[PDB]
Design a protein around this ligand. Structure first.
Ligand SMILES: *[C@H](O)[C@H](C[C@H]1CCNC1=O)NC(=O)[C@H](CC1CC1)NC(=O)c1cc2c(OC)cccc2[nH]1
Ligand SMILES: *[C@H](O)[C@H](C[C@H]1CCNC1=O)NC(=O)[C@H](CC1CC1)NC(=O)c1cc2c(OC)cccc2[nH]1
Lengths: 303, 303
């Protein structure tokens, strides 16, 4: 038993991280087939970051201006293009370690593993959720851009995130692998504020089901509620509205534990209205919302 | 910025996980050079687990009774021995993916990454600490035995843990790669209780330094204390005694933040005596003790 914030095994993605240097800037790139994907602000100087005109800046760049290094192997760049906020550099060599992969744009509330990298070599792995405000609470320093977030389905790596920027509140922002930012953010050094960080309600319910499964059950009460009589309490505490689709997603967990979704909702309402009173749930003194129901089933079933 | 529970990239260890089957039992094994290491209770039946005589049980086993599978490749077993609580099966093929590796027995308070596996294939990665009572708070189901914990120094994988058992309190127990259990535990199905789970004080101080670095500083006070006048409060709350060696280990962090270790100790005393009062530190409502000072420096420096 036991429930942990668990990340996917990262070897398949480790095999795809390279170093991209342009001018003074060095960041990470993702090498799949004969293409290297990287953030486009690799072509910016410290001066261009305030007000970059990426077309004009990119037009002054030739193939040989892009230094791509996989380990110690220098890749030859034979073409380059810009798709939204992502540069795509064509190299002359297909990555021998290219896995079965997809490009997926995940929905808010979904989770994925981030492989934090620096200078094209891996540094660490951790699990993140796409917040309702399209940010992530990660751990990124300078040079971490180009690091990717991904999921794994058997052997297919679904790349969903590439890191671009840290916001003033310390959360992080990025794009999908097609270069489209999650949320309203843009890749320049201006005043950018993320909106209200609301809680992923279905994820908290899934985490409570994981708690029940792993023995923690003090938070279970004799009450029940209705979906509207749960939402009029969730909106007060900045919780995402619970829909019948969320209820059905939580179906298998409710059937495994024998606890109706609305009764667990009553327990969660009691937790929101009275707090933890100094107790913990699965070793946490906060309500955790970065586990999807799929994460819970996968970790409690051994996938 | 940002501070996360971060695990090592697991590809080098993924390349070493195989499936070991004996009779009905199937668990994981670690394939390095021409040797596969696995827990010895792979030779037990459900009946032998209460009172196993591992010499007598192993003596009834021949090489061909050990089915080793790396992916779909069947390894041929050409010898077998028992070292403490670990079986070592000699195979005819050296693992082509054997990394630079060490066998290390870590001290309590140190951390490592666990690669949770089932049927010899990886399932997830997460960071754990060796508690002062020589247990770990992991996530292990049936068939997870043989999963390993490790650290990485540039390119050298230091294997330090192999999982064997879950205790009644839901924490987990295991051996080093030489087969010696951490703590007083034995690999049989008897009444085994871990002792008092005390807190790794130096790790909480390192985590508070990480908090200060990442902007969280509300817990900083105008007070100071002495080491004895901190220990007579730490022992009340079941905190490991702080030694001058722990102070010196925290030296670089204190010099980077400009906060003396004893002043941070006064802040921690205030936290232990008055609680969090509904606040959070680095997104946690509890004092975290599974980050070593090295973990903090590594994550805030980008190693
Ligand atoms: C790429 O490696 C890097 C990400 C690192 C830097 C520090 N922490 C991280 O997450 N990205 C950047 O430095 C980008 C530059 C790209 C054009 C987007 N900029 C920021 O992350 C950035 C800019 C600003 C502010 O600008 C006014 C204000 C507050 C925080 C900021 N972060
Ligand atoms: C090996 O895969 C497995 C580890 C799994 C099983 C459930 N959770 C895990 O961590 N190990 C075992 O099942 C071992 C068997 C080996 C001889 C040690 N046994 C236990 O983990 C075990 C035994 C008992 C109890 O026995 C009285 C009481 C309470 C909890 C127990 N766990």
């Amino acid at each position: 038993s036991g429930f942990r914030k668990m990340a996917f095994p990262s070897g398949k993605v480790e095999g795809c991280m390279v170093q991209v240097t342009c001018g003074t800037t060095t960041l990470n790139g993702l090498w799949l087939d004969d293409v290297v994907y990287c953030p486009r602000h690799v072509i910016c100087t410290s001066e261009d970051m305030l007000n970059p005109n990426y077309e004009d800046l990119l037009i002054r760049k030739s193939n040989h201006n892009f230094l791509v290094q996989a380990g110690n192997v220098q890749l030859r760049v034979i073409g380059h293009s810009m798709q939204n906020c992502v540069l795509k550099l064509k190299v002359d060599t297909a990555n021998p370690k290219t896995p079965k992969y997809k490009f997926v744009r995940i929905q808010p509330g979904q989770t994925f593993s981030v492989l934090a990298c620096y200078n094209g070599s891996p540094s660490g792995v951790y699990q993140c959720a796409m917040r309702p405000n399209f940010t992530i609470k990660g751990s990124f320093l300078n040079g971490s851009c180009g690091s990717v977030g991904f999921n794994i389905d058997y052997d297919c790596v679904s790349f969903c995130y590439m890191h671009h920027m840290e916001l003033p509140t310390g959360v992080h922002a990025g794009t999908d692998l097609e270069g489209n930012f999650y949320g309203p953010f843009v890749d320049r050094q201006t005043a950018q504020a993320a909106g209200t960080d609301t809680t992923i309600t279905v994820n908290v319910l899934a985490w409570l089901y994981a708690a029940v499964i792993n023995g923690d059950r003090w938070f279970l009460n004799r009450f029940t509620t209705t979906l509207n009589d749960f939402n009029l309490v969730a909106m007060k505490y900045n919780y995402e509205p619970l829909t019948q689709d969320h209820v059905d997603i939580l179906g298998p967990l409710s059937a495994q534990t024998g606890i109706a979704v609305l009764d667990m909702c009553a327990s969660l309402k009691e937790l929101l209205q009275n707090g933890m009173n100094g107790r913990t749930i699965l070793g946490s003194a906060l309500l955790e919302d970065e586990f999807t129901p799929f994460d819970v089933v996968r970790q409690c079933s051994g996938v």
